[PDB]
Design a protein around this ligand. Sequence first.
Ligand code: GDP
Ligand code: MG
Length: 169
Amino acid sequence: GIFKVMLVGESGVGKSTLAGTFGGLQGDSAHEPENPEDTYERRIMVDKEEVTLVVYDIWEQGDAGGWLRDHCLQTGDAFLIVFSVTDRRSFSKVPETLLRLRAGRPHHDLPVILVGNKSDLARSREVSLEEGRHLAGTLSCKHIETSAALHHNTRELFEGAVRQIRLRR
Ligand SMILES: Nc1nc2c(ncn2[C@@H]2O[C@H](COP(=O)(O)OP(=O)(O)O)[C@@H](O)[C@H]2O)c(=O)[nH]1
Ligand SMILES: [Mg+2]
C-alpha cells in the first residue's frame, strides 16, 4: 500500500527539517499533483512489511495556505502534530490543531502522533518531556520527542506513523 503522512504545526517547529530526515525522494512542480514540492517519497520496511510512504510538508501558514491545509487534512492517512520543546506557544496550540483535524474528518478515526521537536536544544527548552507526555495522555495520542537536527528518534517517528496507520487497517 501507499501511506500519506502529514507534518503539521506552527512555523519554526522543525517540520521541513523533520521531513528531510525521512530520506525520501523530494517532489517538485514537475511531479504535481501527487508529488509536488515539499513532499518526500520512499519505500520502507516496517515490522517485516514494506510500504510506500509519502511524507508531506505542506502545512503552510496564512490565507494563501488554506487550500493546502484542506488538501492536507482531506488526503492524510496520519498526522504528525509537531511543536518545538523550545517554543511553549507552539505547544499551547497543539489541542486546537488536533481538534481541527479530528473535527474536520468526523467520519474517520485519525491516526496522530504528537512530536516534541528540538530536544537537543537543552539551554532553550520551555516544555518538559513530562508535560508533553501528559498532554498527549489527555488528548488520547502517542507522544515522541525528536531532534530533527541530530536525527534522534526520526526513524522511530516515521516507523511509528506507519504503525498508527496499520492499526486502523
Ligand atoms: N537545534 C535544532 N534546530 C532545529 C531542529 N529542527 C529544526 N531546527 C531549525 O529550526 C529552524 C526552523 O526549522 P524548519 O524545519 O524550517 O521549521 P518549519 O517552519 O516547521 O518548517 C531551522 O533553522 C532548522 O534548522 C532541531 O531538532 N534541533
Ligand atoms: Mg517549513
